[PDB]
Design a protein around this ligand. Structure first.
Ligand SMILES: Cc1cc2nc3c(=O)[nH]c(=O)nc-3n(C[C@H](O)[C@H](O)[C@H](O)COP(=O)(O)O)c2cc1C
Ligand SMILES: Cc1cc2nc3c(=O)[nH]c(=O)nc-3n(C[C@H](O)[C@H](O)[C@H](O)COP(=O)(O)O)c2cc1C
Ligand SMILES: Oc1ccc(O)cc1
Ligand SMILES: Oc1ccc(O)cc1
Lengths: 180, 180
């Protein structure tokens, strides 16, 4: 991580491996995509999510400007596009990405056709905690690939993406352990 | 999920599978443990985390009372204890759990010896979003099993736990995909 003055494992690695998502922001020619690991659900009813975004991301500027974002769920198969989203800066990176933008249902920010799911969000809060803004978004629509969620739960065959360390990613075992 | 009036897939399942963690709260005879999926990192420097906790959890009462919590990282091997933490209520459940409580380094809330990591947190914010409180905790200490993080990144052999649907859990493939 940049800005690690005392060399060693970043403390946050203790929560890893974490899922990796894509955050879409802006629209029209301002459409941008970045990689985000620091995403979670914050409410069931209503459905509300949150994502921690550094002020230095172009994505940060776009979410503040428009008050909307999309969380797109990538699979392992689009890793190259995820790595571009997480390493290049601003809307020009899209020319380098195999992803197709399609209209969202409720938000003006586009969805990604290849994503396993697209979760459409309106910003309801933006708190600063240390070196990131935690953008909290009420979910106002969603679409998904029917097969990635057949029978109302994730289908592990879809290769949902997770992040181990800087350059290294994994998916899940297909081997399900039942708790009851 | 309880309180689903219109039967169907909960929208939040679109972020799944998610990692499953344990949240320790209270101390002495009030020590409690629950399961939590809705956890993420919110800052690198300083290291800050957050967890979404329903007001109805005993854990919610204990974090408000003491202003501290521990995120303990379970492996697949302690699934039975995780399921107890996520289904039974209050400190009496501990009598049913194979877990050993040990002192934390900085917080008064105990750590779990069997956990792959224990992340010690002081509450700095508690916002209400829909039906959960998002407790934000500055990390004031941590311990971990050396082997689960050998070479400063997670060791996939440690069987980090993730949640698919209600009763079903998985771990990660050991098969690493390199992005560069
Ligand atoms: C796997 C991965 C996960 C990332 N997660 C986050 C995150 O949660 N929050 C964040 O602010 N940046 C994250 N980053 C960094 C941004 O994706 C990266 O800075 C990107 O180049 C920003 O692009 P932008 O300036 O177009 O918004 C991540 C990068 C990678 C590779
Ligand atoms: C895998 C799993 C994950 C859970 N995640 C959360 C969560 O993120 N937040 C929450 O409030 N409850 C969560 N729950 C529910 C609580 O763990 C459950 O209500 C528990 O019985 C609460 O115990 P307590 O009353 O002792 O705090 C989860 C349950 C399971 C099984
Ligand atoms: O700001 C960041 C958050 C998570 C990452 O994996 C990388 C950068
Ligand atoms: O409040 C809850 C959050 C996540 C869960 O998996 C279960 C309950």
């Amino acid at each position: 991580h940049e800005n690690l003055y005392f060399q060693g494992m970043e403390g946050y690695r203790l929560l890893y491996p974490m899922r990796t998502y894509l955050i879409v922001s802006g629209h029209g020619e301002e459409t941008n995509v970045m990689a985000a690991d620091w995403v979670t659900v914050v409410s069931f009813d209503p459905f509300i999510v949150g994502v921690a975004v550094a002020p230095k991301r172009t994505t940060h500027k776009l979410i503040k400007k428009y008050g909307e974002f999309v969380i797109s769920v990538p699979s392992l198969d689009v890793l190259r596009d995820v790595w571009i989203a997480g390493t290049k800066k601003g809307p020009s990176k899209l020319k380098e990405m195999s992803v197709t933008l399609i209209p969202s249902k409720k938000v003006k920010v586009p969805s990604i056709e290849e994503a396993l799911a697209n979760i459409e969000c309106r910003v309801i809060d933006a708190r600063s905690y240390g070196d990131h803004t935690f953008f909290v978004g009420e979910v106002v629509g969603y679409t998904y690939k029917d097969y990635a969620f057949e029978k109302g739960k994730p289908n592990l065959k879809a290769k949902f993406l997770a992040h181990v360390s800087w350059s290294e990613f994994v998916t899940f075992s297909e081997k399900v352990h039942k708790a009851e």
